[PDB]
Amino acid sequence: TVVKASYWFPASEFPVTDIDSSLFTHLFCAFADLNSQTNQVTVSSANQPKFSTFTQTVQRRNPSVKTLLSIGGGIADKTAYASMASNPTSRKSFIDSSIRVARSYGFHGLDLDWEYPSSATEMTNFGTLLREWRSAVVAEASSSGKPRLLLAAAVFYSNNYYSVLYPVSAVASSLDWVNLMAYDFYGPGWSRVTGPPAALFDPSNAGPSGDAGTRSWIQAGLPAKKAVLGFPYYGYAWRLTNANSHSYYAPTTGAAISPDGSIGYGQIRKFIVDNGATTVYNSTVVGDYCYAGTNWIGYDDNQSIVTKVRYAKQRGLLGYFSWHVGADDNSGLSRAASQAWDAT
């Protein structure tokens, strides 16, 4: 009916008890790993205590909240995932273990975060993996008598990944939904100019946008009620070449603030207060930015989040999610998101 979601990961150092579960319907705990020798889903011994208690802990502040265990993530070994998905026997050990782990750790479902299958070969295997995964959770629910495990996947902002097409049929028939990663569009690591890292819209049609990706997914066959629209609780910081040029697409000399420019929303708000920064909400792209001196940060603030949540609701999407729950400022963005959804 509605997904109001966020991701939690242990390196954020955000206590699980600090998640305001009343603001969410689903919480993602990230990340379980793929053992490349056994082809099984495993939780690292470091992650075992927090992952295993994640669900009952978040349920303290909202007994109705559901949880999913995410697998892979940004720094996963993609060759391992491709090898696993390539063979019926390795897919089976992945599927079976993933189901045992979820049940034993008390998760209500599983989320595959392979970012991203990067060939038609990998996409075919990916699609087959999902089909077998759905049959398997259906089989385990009939065999254990328990409610069926949920299945989701974090996916490219578009179904078209640099000319490689997701198997939309397999996605739509197998998964409860996909998490659309409509962010990381611009960063100083790959852009020599400033830009809206999660823009909902692009009038000039020169770059990515969440609206263009979402529409592309729907055109390709994804039911809207199987799309959950993602936004970042972080931004990217650039060093301006010239203080007097501070709009989108302004010249820069590289990253500021951190090595790849990334900075959590909480730290952005602090930057703003500490520096008395200029703040802009640009409604043409649906993106926020701020600057002080030669420091320029593009990110999502209140107005970006609220507009995106309203877009998600009005265009018939299942809901929204944020990366990540530990970067919000006292649940301000998540609280705004929920209230914006409920009022629309």
From Swiss-Prot:
Which keywords does this chain's UniProt record carry?
Answer: Carbohydrate metabolism, Chitin degradation, Glycoprotein, Glycosidase, Hydrolase, Polysaccharide degradation, Signal
A cellular component term from Gene Ontology for this protein is:
secretory vesicle
Q: Name one Pfam family in it.
A: Glyco_hydro_18
Sequence ranges assigned to domain GH18 in this UniProt record: 2-344
Induction annotation: Induced by jasmonic acid (JA), abscisic acid (ABA) and salt (NaCl).
Q: Which Gene3D superfamilies match?
A: 3.10.50.10, Glycosidases (3.20.20.80)
Q: What InterPro entries does the record point to?
A: Chitinase_II/V-like_cat (IPR011583), Chitinase_insertion_sf (IPR029070), Glyco_hydro18_cat (IPR001223), Glycoside_hydrolase_SF (IPR017853), Glycosyl_Hydrlase_18 (IPR050314)
> Which residues does the Swiss-Prot or TrEMBL record annotate as the active site?
E115
To which pathway does this protein belong?
Glycan degradation; chitin degradation
The record lists the membrane-crossing segments as: none
Catalysed transformations (reactions): Random endo-hydrolysis of N-acetyl-beta-D-glucosaminide (1->4)-beta-linkages in chitin and chitodextrins; Hydrolysis of N,N'-diacetylchitobiose from the non-reducing end of chitin and chitodextrins
So which residues have sugars stuck on them? N282, N302
Q: Report the record's Gene Ontology biological process terms.
A: chitin catabolic process; polysaccharide catabolic process; response to abscisic acid; response to jasmonic acid; response to salt stress
* Molecular-function GO term, any one: chitinase activity
**Does the UniProt entry include the keyword GTP-binding?**
no
* Annotated binding of chitin, by residue: G74, Y234, W323
Task: Give EC number(s), comma-separated.
Answer: 3.2.1.14, 3.2.1.200
Instruction: Give a yes or no for keyword Signal in this entry.
Output: yes
In UniProt terms, what function does this protein have? Can hydrolyze glycol chitin and chitin oligosaccharides (e.g. N-acetylglucosamine) (GlcNAc)4, (GlcNAc)5 and (GlcNAc)6. Hydrolyzes N-acetylglucosamine oligomers producing dimers from the non-reducing end of the substrates.
The identity of this protein, by name, is Class V chitinase
Q: Which organism is it from?
A: Arabidopsis thaliana
Q: Which gene encodes it?
A: ChiC
